[PDB]
Amino acid sequence: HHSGLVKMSHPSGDVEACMVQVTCGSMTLNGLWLDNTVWCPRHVMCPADQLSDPNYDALLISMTNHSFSVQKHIGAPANLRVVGHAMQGTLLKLTVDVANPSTPAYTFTTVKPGAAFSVLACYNGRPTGTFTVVMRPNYTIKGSFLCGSCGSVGYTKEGSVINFCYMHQMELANGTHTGSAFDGTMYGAFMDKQVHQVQLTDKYCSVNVVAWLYAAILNGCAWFVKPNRTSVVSFNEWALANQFTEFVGTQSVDMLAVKTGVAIEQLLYAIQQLYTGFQGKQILGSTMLEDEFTPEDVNMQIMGVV
Amino acid sequence: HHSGLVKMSHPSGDVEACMVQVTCGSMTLNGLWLDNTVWCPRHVMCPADQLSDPNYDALLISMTNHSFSVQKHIGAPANLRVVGHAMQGTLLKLTVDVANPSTPAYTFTTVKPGAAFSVLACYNGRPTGTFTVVMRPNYTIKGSFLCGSCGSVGYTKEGSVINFCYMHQMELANGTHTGSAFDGTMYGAFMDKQVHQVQLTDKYCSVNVVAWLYAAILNGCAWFVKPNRTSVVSFNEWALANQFTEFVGTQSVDMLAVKTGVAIEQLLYAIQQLYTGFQGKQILGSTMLEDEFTPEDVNMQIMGVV
C-alpha cells in the first residue's frame, strides 16, 4: 500500500525567472536577481590558489563594478551592468541598473532544523533540477550539488510570496551540503573557506517522525499504536540520551492528532519502542524511522490542508 | 589577581538615536527606526485579553496606518506619521514619512549560540540600560527585561557598522528571554502567543569555556594544564554525552593558543576533568566552568586585539 507521500517541491517557475550567472574573471557561479539587486556567494571573488585562506575584505576592496559580469540566459536574455557592490557576511550584494521585471513577491527568512524547503539547482545561471530537503539538526542538508552549483537557491512559499532561505556554498566531508541565509550568515558553524571543517552530529527530527507515524495511521497502518503514553517532558529527557531532537508541538501536529484520534503522547511512546527495533515489522514500507516528512507535508499531501 | 574580564557592551549612543515608542490602541512597546522604516513586535496589535490565540493576519488587515502612533522621545522629539504597514514573521514593518536622520550604517544578521551581543533595554521608547549576553544553545538569553521592554534591540558591531540581531519578545518560565531576528523569525522554536511553551535543554558553550581557560592561563593561573590532549573529534563525542556544545575552532581561538603556547586539545582534556569537579581549587575565582565570555572578549580585553 502506497502512503501517498512523495518528496514534493514547490513549482519553480517564479524562481527560475530570477536566476543569473555571475562572473568575476576566471570565476563564475549563480546569482539571484531581485529588484535591482543580485545576490551571490562571495567566493566568486577568490582566485583558485587562494580559496584555502582568502582575505575577503581585501578581495572586495580590489574589485570595481566593472569587475563583475551578470547575465540572464533563460527566457529573455539580459546583460546587467553592475553599478554598486557590497559584502554581507558570506554573500555579495551587487546593485544592477535594471530591476528584474519578473521579481516575484518575496521575503528573506531563515529555516530551522527539521523544516523543509525547495531547492533550484543551477549551473552557469541555468536551472537544471529541483528537489526538496529538510534542514538537518546539524545545519546541513542532504542535497545533490556538483561543481558550479554554488549560488543555487532554496525557498519556501507562503501563498504567492516566496521566502528565500538558502543559497548554496559547499559540500562537507560526509557528502552533505550547506549554504548561507540571505543575511549572509552560514547555516551552522561553517566558514566559506576551502579547508576541512569540523562537522557536528546529526539527530532524528522527532516532530517529523511523529508526522510520519500519523501518516501511517492515516493510511490504515496502526499496529504500533498502543494505549500507553509518554509525556512530552519525559520524551524530551529521553531524547537527549538517544540522538533525537526535543519534541515541540505545533498546530500542524495537533490537526493530525484530531483527525486520527491518536494522541501525540501515544506516538512518543511508540517512537521509544520502535527505536529499539521494529521486530520484523514495517511501517509504510520502512524498517526504520523516517524523519524527512514534516507535519505540513502530511497535512497537505494526505488531507489537502494548507 | 583580577583577570581584567568584565561584561563589556558596545557604546549605545548610535542605537539610542534609533529607538521609538510604538502605540496601537491601548497597547504600547518600543520600535527601531531606520531610514523610513520602524520595526516592532507584531503583538502590539493584540488586545491584552487575546494574546493567548491571536489571529495576526486578521489583526493586520483590520488596521490602517492611523492605527499606529510612533514617537521619538530622545533628543529632538517627534511624532512620526505612518504611511504604510506590513508584517514580516513576528515583526511589524511600519513605513513612516520621515527618514531617521541619525540612521547609522547597519545590517541585519542572526547571532549563533555562544556569540555575544549588546542589548539596549528600553521602556516607552526611552533607553534605560545596556548589557551584554551570549546566545544560549537553546536560543534563549539570560537577560533583564520587564513588562514594557518588548522591542528592545540587540546588536553587534563591525567597525562603524551596527549589525542588528535581536528584537525582544518574551520571557520564559525559567526566567530566560527570547526574541526575533529582523527577518521576523523567532530565535528557537518559540511562538509569539501567550501560551506556555516547551523550552529546550541548555548546554555549556564549549568554545567559550575554552576562551575562559585561556584567560586564566594569560592571567598566570595554569594549574589545570597537563601534557594530555583530547582531539576535537573525541571531545565532541564526549560533549554530546555531557551537555556541552560541540567545539568548532576559530581564528580567534587560534590566536589565544599561539599567545599562551597551550594547544586547544590540552584545554579540551582539561574541561573533561574539571567538569567532574575542581577538587576544591579555583579558576579565576570560580569553582565552576564559565561559558559567558567569548574568544573575542579574551583577545580584546586581555590582549588588546580587536
Ligand SMILES: *[C@H](O)[C@H](C[C@@H]1CCNC1=O)NC(=O)[C@H](CC(C)C)NC(=O)OC[C@H]1CCC(=O)N1CC1CCCCC1
Ligand atoms: C560551489 O559551486 C562549490 C559547490 C560544491 C562543489 C562540490 N559540490 C558542492 O556542493 N563549492 C565549493 O567548491 C566550496 C568552496 C569554498 C571556498 C566554500 N568548497 C567545497 O565545497 O569544498 C569541497 C568539499 C568536498 C569534500 C570536502 O571536505 N570539501 C572541502 C575540502 C576539499 C579538500 C581540501 C580541503 C577542503
Ligand SMILES: *[C@H](O)[C@H](C[C@@H]1CCNC1=O)NC(=O)[C@H](CC(C)C)NC(=O)OC[C@H]1CCC(=O)N1CC1CCCCC1
Ligand atoms: C513585551 O514587553 C513582554 C516582555 C516580557 C514581559 C515580562 N518580561 C518580559 O521580558 N512580552 C510578553 O509579555 C510576552 C508576550 C507574548 C505575546 C509573546 N509574554 C510573556 O512574556 O508572558 C509572560 C511570561 C512570564 C513567565 C511565563 O511563563 N510567561 C508566559 C510566556 C512564556 C513564553 C511563551 C509565551 C508565554
